[PDB]
Write a protein that holds these residues in place. Structure first.
Motif, PDB file in Angstrom:
ATOM      1  N   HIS A  74      43.292  46.742  45.797  1.00  0.00           N
ATOM      2  CA  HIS A  74      44.569  46.052  45.961  1.00  0.00           C
ATOM      3  C   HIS A  74      45.697  46.768  45.202  1.00  0.00           C
ATOM      4  CE1 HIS A  74      42.902  41.731  46.863  1.00  0.00           C
ATOM      5  NE2 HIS A  74      42.283  42.650  47.600  1.00  0.00           N
ATOM      6  N   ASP A  75      46.894  46.759  45.785  1.00  0.00           N
ATOM      7  CA  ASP A  75      48.173  47.221  45.241  1.00  0.00           C
ATOM      8  C   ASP A  75      48.136  48.592  44.570  1.00  0.00           C
ATOM      9  OD1 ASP A  75      49.243  44.763  46.120  1.00  0.00           O
ATOM     10  OD2 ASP A  75      48.404  43.827  44.331  1.00  0.00           O
ATOM     11  N   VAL A  97      44.275  47.465  41.501  1.00  0.00           N
ATOM     12  CA  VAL A  97      43.338  46.411  41.124  1.00  0.00           C
ATOM     13  C   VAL A  97      42.125  46.568  42.028  1.00  0.00           C
ATOM     14  CG1 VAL A  97      42.906  43.928  40.938  1.00  0.00           C
ATOM     15  CG2 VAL A  97      45.123  44.870  40.192  1.00  0.00           C
ATOM     16  N   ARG A 126      38.717  44.909  43.573  1.00  0.00           N
ATOM     17  CA  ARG A 126      38.205  43.563  43.856  1.00  0.00           C
ATOM     18  C   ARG A 126      36.811  43.638  44.484  1.00  0.00           C
ATOM     19  NH1 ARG A 126      41.861  39.422  44.266  1.00  0.00           N
ATOM     20  NH2 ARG A 126      39.959  38.146  44.233  1.00  0.00           N
TER      21      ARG A 126
HETATM   22 CL   LIG Z   1      45.027  41.513  43.398  1.00  0.00          CL
END
Ligand SMILES: [Cl-]
Ligand SMILES: [Cl-]
Ligand SMILES: [Mg+2]
Lengths: 282, 285
Positions: free
Chosen positions: A72-73, A119, A121
């Motif tokens: 993520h991001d 991030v 996950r």
């Molecule tokens: Cl996130």
């Protein structure tokens, strides 16, 4: 003499002797370790492609969280100029179950520079997107865009893709009113022997990012040098060894940048990797 | 792709910080190293002090750029082994040619120091002179059987299995002559997996055992005698062909021993020096 299998870019891996759980890798993304990285140049100097950070994040998910999971991001910070040897330090710190802070940093004699952040996950129960019909995709995108001419266009604004980064053979589009691009992309033959170990070879992923620029809407705004800045969501569903196509969707294209969603496909139209919210800009 | 790793030090990185600092994450468990099941204290596998000696010797070249030598090695907290036993090794360069070395482990959520030393790269030491093996053996006519010596260690709870049975026999004069000559070799089966070691810990441990065959040691130091530290360690070349160990008792009292050792090839060439080996009970419990 014993040996340990290592990721080609992340390199040597350790877990720091402390709490909370923190991973550290020391790799080398220099052009002597990886000659194919000489083939991605900005103003005739070798620069690490954003696709390499994507791979570093994707490759770090399983060792850190116990599953392939997703990224993520992901954001790319100061552009990294490569040398014969370019040491990189990748870090992943578990902040809670199923989630970890990801970073990539380098050194220039005496200053630490952050190169990418994301991030990781491992608890997102994602369902693989439905497979496509390659024949039906191609029938709906009748206008061919030659890979060599697309790369020549990139050269006019100072982006140089040599042989390793020449994996986009052709892109197929309809008009600017249809937001999709179907591209024929494959990892060049000389890199196919050094593909095991990679979640996605960065040279293939960069060729997929390049295909977004073939879209007529992106061509119409003539913004100039468009380079990857980040990716909102990255997820591999299987090996990317048999990737032969990339279906991209333009989410937004204007003076501030281009956002697109990408799906890497095999010849059967199976989705092997998703890259949602690819951000391109100057 | 793959990288060559030291069998005990394992995966190696340089931390992203200044001053220069090295970190390794290794495994000294019995599943990765089955021969380590053969060094037991009170019938449980425990990492021998010789393993820390090897870890420090193996760290000098990657940290300081030369084989150099190791000073003031200490290891006072017996490490109980499991199938997997993670170790973290650190080396912080404090000055050109010097580095602070350390070894630590985890148990639950607590960190324990297992060994400390100083790595040195700028000591221009000369190899000690070679010996006539015939002259050494003629001067130490009294034989001490390896098996009987190890049976004596078993009485105080130290169990040396096949991998740690490299001492065949020791030769002594009387308690008034401070030297021991020992016939010591790495057991045949470990000779294939000896690559990457400066000194195989099972060989070095068998040399440390030979010190206890000395009649001065037997006459006064009657308890458990485990290695606790080494003041100076230096390898002069490969130790693959070590066949003898010449030791000198520097100190011996009710609680322990201090000895100097030279590992020799069959021609009496000195391949490794260990000065100020310290033996004592330590923390057996
Ligand atoms: Cl996130
Ligand atoms: Cl190593
Ligand atoms: Mg076991």
């Amino acid at each position: 003499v014993p040996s340990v299998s290592v990721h080609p870019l992340l390199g040597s891996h350790v877990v720091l002797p402390q709490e909370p759980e923190e991973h550290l890798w020391q790799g080398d993304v220099g052009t002597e370790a990886h000659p194919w990285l000489s083939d991605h140049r900005v103003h005739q100097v070798a620069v690490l492609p954003g696709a390499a950070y994507c791979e570093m994040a994707l490759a770090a998910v399983t060792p850190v969280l116990g599953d392939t999971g997703e990224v993520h991001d992901l954001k790319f910070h100061d552009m990294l100029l490569l040398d014969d040897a370019t040491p990189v330090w990748v870090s992943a710190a578990v902040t809670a179950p199923g989630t970890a802070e990801f970073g990539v940093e380098t050194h220039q004699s005496g200053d630490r520079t952050q190169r990418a952040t994301a991030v990781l996950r491992g608890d997102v129960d994602a369902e693989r997107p439905a497979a496509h019909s390659i024949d039906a995709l191609l029938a709906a995108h009748p206008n061919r865009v030659d890979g060599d001419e697309l790369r020549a266009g990139f050269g006019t604004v100072g982006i140089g893709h040599g042989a390793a980064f020449a994996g986009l053979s052709e892109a197929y589009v309809a008009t600017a009113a249809e937001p999709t691009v179907v591209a024929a992309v494959a990892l060049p033959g000389p890199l196919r022997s050094g593909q095991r170990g990679y979640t996605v070879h960065p040279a293939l992923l960069d060729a997929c990012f390049q295909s977004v620029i073939a879209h007529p809407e992106v061509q119409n705004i003539a913004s100039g040098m468009l380079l990857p800045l980040g990716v909102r969501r990255l997820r591999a569903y299987g090996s990317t060894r048999n990737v032969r196509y990339c279906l991209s969707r333009i989410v937004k294209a204007d003076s501030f940048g281009v956002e697109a969603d990408l799906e890497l496909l095999d010849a059967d139209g199976t989705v092997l990797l998703s890259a949602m919210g690819l951000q391109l800009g100057t």
